[PDB]
Amino acid sequence: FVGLRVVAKWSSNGYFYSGKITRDVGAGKYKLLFDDGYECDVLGKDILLCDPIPLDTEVTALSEDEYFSAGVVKGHRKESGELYYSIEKEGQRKWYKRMAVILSLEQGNRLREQYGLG
Amino acid sequence: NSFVGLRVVAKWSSNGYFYSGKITRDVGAGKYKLLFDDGYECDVLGKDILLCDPIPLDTEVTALSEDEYFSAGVVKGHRKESGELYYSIEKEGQRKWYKRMAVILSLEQGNRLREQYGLG
Ligand SMILES: CN1CCN(c2ccnc(C(=O)N3CCC[C@H](C(=O)Nc4cccc(-c5ccc6c(c5)C(=O)NC6)c4)C3)c2)CC1
Numbered sequence: 007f008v009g010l011r012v013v014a015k016w017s018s019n020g021y022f023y024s025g026k027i028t029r030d031v032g033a034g035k036y037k038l039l040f041d042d043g044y045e046c047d048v049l050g051k052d053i054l055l056c057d058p059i060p061l062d063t064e065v066t067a068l069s070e071d072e073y074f075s076a077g078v079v080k081g082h083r084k085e086s087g088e089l090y091y092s093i094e095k096e097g098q099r100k101w102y103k104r105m106a107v108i109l110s111l112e113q114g115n116r117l118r119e120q121y122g123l124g
Numbered sequence: 125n126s127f128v129g130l131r132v133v134a135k136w137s138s139n140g141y142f143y144s145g146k147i148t149r150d151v152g153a154g155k156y157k158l159l160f161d162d163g164y165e166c167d168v169l170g171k172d173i174l175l176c177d178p179i180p181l182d183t184e185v186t187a188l189s190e191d192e193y194f195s196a197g198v199v200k201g202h203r204k205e206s207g208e209l210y211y212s213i214e215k216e217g218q219r220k221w222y223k224r225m226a227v228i229l230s231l232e233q234g235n236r237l238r239e240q241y242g243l244g
């Protein structure tokens with residue numbers, strides 16, 4: 007799974023963030039380089055093998071002035087080599103960059119069976 | 125004397141971080157109802173509430189920038205401008221200004237103020 011882009015749990019807070027597996031560190035763990043530059047060891051069970059976050063996934067969308075809310079991925083777009091998510095909330099859609107989309111513990115848990123490593 | 129109506133820095137249970145808000149109710153036995161400056165509300169134990177507004181000078185804090193970037197820094201100034209509070213935060217010998225909604229405390233940072241500023 008080394009070099010693959012994933013969505014993984016940051017241990018200290020239960021949230022799942024996009025990043026890449028850089029190394030297999032053994033004991034069921036892998037080194038992760040997160041898209042924000044942070045690094046840590048994550049257990050295979052806490053790594054979802056999906057890039058991009060799939061359509062119809064319930065996510066946490068991050069706005070300006072630290073505001074965040076739940077919504078559903080209804081689109082993917084590529085623009086100048088960057089990924090954007092079209093997130094639906096109360097029948098309307100807004101575009102969010104890859105760095106503005108995360109999963110809560112419960113939202114991530116929902117993808118474990120189909121996308122988890124373990 | 126009651127702490128109800130006072131502006132504080134309180135722990136949000138789900139992540140260990142401390143945020144500015146106001147105590148709205150004494151819900152008995154050392155717990156209080158909190159209205160946070162972002163509009164969120166919950167019950168917080170007195171021991172997890174810091175009685176300080178503004179966050180004092182020389183406090184180690186977590187400063188929030190744009191595009192979700194955050195870092196540790198030390199409060200070296202307080203400024204009132206157009207009726208609003210700003211914190212001058214020092215990081216590796218340089219200072220930047222942050223609004224009240226861009227300054228929080230981690231679990232360890234808030235724990236350090238419990239003995240001097242905590243309620244319970
Ligand atoms: C008093 N109030 C206090 C606040 N409060 C919370 C209630 C529940 N949860 C929280 C919380 O705590 N969070 C949710 C909002 C986003 C927070 C985050 O996670 N910030 C961040 C900060 C820095 C970076 C990246 C980031 C992004 C996207 C990506 C990456 C990296 C990355 O590596 N790949 C993709 C995100 C977490 C607050 C309500 C009550």
Ligand SMILES: CN1CCN(c2ccnc(C(=O)N3CCC[C@H](C(=O)Nc4cccc(-c5ccc6c(c5)C(=O)NC6)c4)C3)c2)CC1
Pocket residue numbers: 016018019023040041042044072073074139141143144145160161162163188194224225226227228
């Ligand atoms: C892969 N990466 C993923 C990200 N990652 C983390 C490592 C440690 N911690 C976090 C984290 O999770 N947080 C830190 C950054 C701010 C996050 C927050 O707390 N966001 C927020 C969201 C919404 C509102 C208010 C807010 C503000 C100020 C105030 C109030 C309300 C308020 O009520 N009074 C004052 C803040 C929490 C990420 C590093 C590794």
